[PDB]
Design an enzyme around this catalytic site. Sequence first.
Site, PDB file in Angstrom:
ATOM      1  N   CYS A  56       0.938  -1.490   0.070  1.00  0.00           N
ATOM      2  CA  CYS A  56       0.026  -0.084  -0.070  1.00  0.00           C
ATOM      3  C   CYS A  56       0.932   1.336  -0.056  1.00  0.00           C
ATOM      4  O   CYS A  56       0.349   2.539  -0.225  1.00  0.00           O
ATOM      5  CB  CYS A  56      -1.120   0.128   1.176  1.00  0.00           C
ATOM      6  N   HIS A  92      -9.524   2.675  -0.830  1.00  0.00           N
ATOM      7  CA  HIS A  92      -8.264   2.407  -0.846  1.00  0.00           C
ATOM      8  C   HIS A  92      -7.599   1.666  -1.955  1.00  0.00           C
ATOM      9  O   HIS A  92      -7.961   0.530  -2.246  1.00  0.00           O
ATOM     10  CB  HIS A  92      -7.821   1.423   0.665  1.00  0.00           C
ATOM     11  N   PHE A  96       1.635  -3.386   4.121  1.00  0.00           N
ATOM     12  CA  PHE A  96       1.942  -4.786   4.904  1.00  0.00           C
ATOM     13  C   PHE A  96       3.271  -4.980   4.688  1.00  0.00           C
ATOM     14  O   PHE A  96       4.106  -4.432   3.547  1.00  0.00           O
ATOM     15  CB  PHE A  96       1.290  -5.826   4.362  1.00  0.00           C
ATOM     16  N   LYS A 137      -9.193   8.781   2.116  1.00  0.00           N
ATOM     17  CA  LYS A 137      -9.925   7.538   1.694  1.00  0.00           C
ATOM     18  C   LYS A 137     -11.387   7.258   2.183  1.00  0.00           C
ATOM     19  O   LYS A 137     -12.005   6.324   1.685  1.00  0.00           O
ATOM     20  CB  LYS A 137      -8.871   6.211   2.482  1.00  0.00           C
ATOM     21  N   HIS A 173      -2.462   8.362   5.901  1.00  0.00           N
ATOM     22  CA  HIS A 173      -2.718   7.221   5.177  1.00  0.00           C
ATOM     23  C   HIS A 173      -4.151   6.528   5.505  1.00  0.00           C
ATOM     24  O   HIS A 173      -5.000   6.174   4.423  1.00  0.00           O
ATOM     25  CB  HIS A 173      -1.675   6.067   5.375  1.00  0.00           C
ATOM     26  N   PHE A 195       1.637   3.478   3.935  1.00  0.00           N
ATOM     27  CA  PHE A 195       2.195   2.323   4.655  1.00  0.00           C
ATOM     28  C   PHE A 195       1.953   1.465   4.101  1.00  0.00           C
ATOM     29  O   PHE A 195       0.704   1.270   3.241  1.00  0.00           O
ATOM     30  CB  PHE A 195       1.761   2.344   6.298  1.00  0.00           C
TER      31      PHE A 195
HETATM   32  C1  LIG Z   1       2.434  -3.188   8.818  1.00  0.00           C
HETATM   33  C2  LIG Z   1       1.251  -3.092   8.571  1.00  0.00           C
HETATM   34  C3  LIG Z   1       0.558  -1.849   8.061  1.00  0.00           C
HETATM   35  C4  LIG Z   1       1.313  -0.613   7.794  1.00  0.00           C
HETATM   36  C5  LIG Z   1      -0.729  -1.831   7.740  1.00  0.00           C
HETATM   37  C6  LIG Z   1      -1.562  -0.667   7.442  1.00  0.00           C
HETATM   38  C7  LIG Z   1      -1.923   0.052   8.620  1.00  0.00           C
HETATM   39  S1  LIG Z   1      -1.085   0.012   5.707  1.00  0.00           S
HETATM   40  C8  LIG Z   1      -2.574  -0.389   5.162  1.00  0.00           C
HETATM   41  O1  LIG Z   1      -2.828  -0.056   3.879  1.00  0.00           O
HETATM   42  C9  LIG Z   1      -3.708  -1.036   5.820  1.00  0.00           C
HETATM   43  C10 LIG Z   1      -4.951  -1.267   5.422  1.00  0.00           C
HETATM   44  C11 LIG Z   1      -3.039  -1.353   6.973  1.00  0.00           C
HETATM   45  O2  LIG Z   1      -3.936  -2.114   7.837  1.00  0.00           O
END
Ligand SMILES: C=C/C(C)=C/[C@@]1(C)SC(=O)C(C)=C1O
EC number: 2.3.1.41
Lengths: 403, 403
Positions: free
Chosen positions: B162, B332, B391, B327, B297, B389
């Site tokens: 993401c 998203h 995963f 968003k 984000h 941010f």
């Molecule tokens: C390391 C994990 C992270 C940054 C997870 C985030 C916050 S980033 C994102 O796009 C979504 C849906 C999440 O849940």
Amino acid sequence: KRAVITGLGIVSSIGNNQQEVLASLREGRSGITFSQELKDSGMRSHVWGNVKLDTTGLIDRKVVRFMSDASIYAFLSMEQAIADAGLSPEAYQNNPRVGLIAGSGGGSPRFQVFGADAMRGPRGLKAVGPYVVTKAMASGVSACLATPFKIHGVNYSISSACATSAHCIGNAVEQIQLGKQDIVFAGGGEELCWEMACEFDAMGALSTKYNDTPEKASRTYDAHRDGFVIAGGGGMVVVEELEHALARGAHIYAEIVGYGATSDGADMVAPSGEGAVRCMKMAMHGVDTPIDYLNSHGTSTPVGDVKELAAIREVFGDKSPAISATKAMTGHSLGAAGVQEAIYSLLMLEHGFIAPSINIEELDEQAAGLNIVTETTDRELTTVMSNSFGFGGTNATLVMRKL
Amino acid sequence: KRAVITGLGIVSSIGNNQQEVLASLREGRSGITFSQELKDSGMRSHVWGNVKLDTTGLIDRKVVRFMSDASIYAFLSMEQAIADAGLSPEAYQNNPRVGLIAGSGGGSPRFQVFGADAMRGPRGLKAVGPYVVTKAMASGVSACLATPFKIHGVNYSISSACATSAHCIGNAVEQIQLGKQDIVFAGGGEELCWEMACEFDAMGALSTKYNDTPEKASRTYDAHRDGFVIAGGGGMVVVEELEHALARGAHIYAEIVGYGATSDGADMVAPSGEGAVRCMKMAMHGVDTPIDYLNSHGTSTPVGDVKELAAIREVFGDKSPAISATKAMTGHSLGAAGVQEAIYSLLMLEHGFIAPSINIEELDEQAAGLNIVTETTDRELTTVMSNSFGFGGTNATLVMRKL
Ligand SMILES: C=C/C(C)=C/[C@@]1(C)SC(=O)C(C)=C1O
Ligand SMILES: C=C/C(C)=C/[C@@]1(C)SC(=O)C(C)=C1O
Ligand SMILES: [Cl-]
Ligand SMILES: [Cl-]
């Protein structure tokens, strides 16, 4: 700032570590085998460069549950590279100056497919389970390594098809040059699976005429070549800022003295040649020693092989480096090819030999005027180059030199 | 060297070009709709931020045959960005100083699954056809654009889940800083499909309680948020070296005065916050002006929304900036979110307004004492920040400032 390679790790069709790989390269040993999986899937190509390693239990259950095979191979390669670099957990973990740039060409077609298959079955979301995004997403290899290895600096994948892991290494060099990182682990991984292989077969890209003699199917520059032999595996190198390396008494294989990255802007699935010329010249700029050895991209494809030779002839004129296509031994590990071939090139540099370009029974006419090496040759090398290209006309070249 | 943004283009759930997106942002208009496809697949989440554009015939047959939707969206966005920038083919084509860095979070699960489904039928390879590799490969968004736009400079994708298109923009800035490129087209695309969406639903990541009221499902900071609303689309910006831009009389939206990229090294699917703090601080280093607006984000996830707010409080102390989570309107778009949100942020800077954070019916207790802007507000802005941010604990922050 200058960037050097202080550690390497590899899981390849020709060896599960640098000792096995070194031995295979010196022996001209094929990593290609017959695949019942590919045959059973309905493909015309039934050969592959498989990883011959039981990975059961090599990675902690809670870490591996997120991983596809590309990430497994890259993770094991990173373990090797860390040990090789002499880096303690305290040296590289939880350190904002230590990063990771590693990718895959395909990600995980197998897990993309698994998710959709499971979703369509009687358990729907419960069969899919909670681990498919990290397996299937294009950045799986960097996400799945940066997390368990406690990386705090850069964390992303470059994705550029069959040039992927070469651009990962070049981008790692850029992070060192910009003074942003002191160490970047760079490389990639690629799974081996009919799910992905069949798409290449469907475009006629893979070898199909040599299934009965798998070790002869990959035959870069041979007049009877008929496409590449797909492979999987991983590789990782430790890219490190020079002063930082010297200060800790690191073992340094080589300095990355050149990095070219260019674009053809021409055709999707055939190279222009001109992009490769520009890429090699870019990587040579300011390099004041000759290129002693060139590890060609050399896929065993009718058009591709000679396009790249024509490019090499344009760059070097009558002063060809020694050239070999190690893919004739290893097959084509796609996004993992660039780092694995950088590693083969570094092992040649470190151990003073040129690996053979195997399976040339009738050398393509266009190799005339060049130095294609078909026998293992002991030779003191100083400067080596390695080319990687991908669909989309994406080009990467790395030049590595002894300090 | 300094890097500026001199053109932009966008295909989003809230508009098919910058005029439509500007109007939607000002109106607080939701791009979210009920999806019969998602419901029919057996998913629990039945809502999505779809592109409302018939893309049939918009791209030359010989170009689009290689493309998946992510690449179509990015290609159309790049056409808009070239026109917006005032760039002629004479200026940007066959030019080694002009590059492209654009990616997707997922490649094409739709085409990977199509390949495997076709192959498994009675016609095998013939049913797959020769176009599936390029449609399904991770680097499709860069490959399929660099080729028809005749790009000769850098050509590759960054992939970081993401965060993908935000890292693409930052790497473009690095190319300008290294003196390697004068223009880099940067951005990304993402397809919208049950094949991919079901992977996120299977980890419980998608909103499922609001299917009857699709426009209310995405609700960043609301106490009863219940996951993100998946979306597709694309975006592209023209990243250009400052002197090169001035010399051609470019229209300059903003200078990219900061770029943070860090790693959590902690958890795969939940943020640490600590990495985000470092990422924002990195982007603000040497930036001598306050942040007037922060596009978070802000995905509408219970843990993520407030982890990011905690990090914001730590970075800004007792001087927090105005914040909104676009968003809640757009959903998203995964790998396309970073460039689309940079674009919304640039439209806010250029037109002097802050877009509202919609659907906050009850503000989360952990969001108290911050200026979360919930109505469109005209305001002259100078410096804006946008976070992305992904995963694997990958973080990107961009800071953009009027010149
Ligand atoms: C390391 C994990 C992270 C940054 C997870 C985030 C916050 S980033 C994102 O796009 C979504 C849906 C999440 O849940
Ligand atoms: C633009 C197209 C290019 C570079 C195609 C090459 C030579 S790169 C590669 O790995 C294979 C198998 C090819 O066919
Ligand atoms: Cl030896
Ligand atoms: Cl206006």
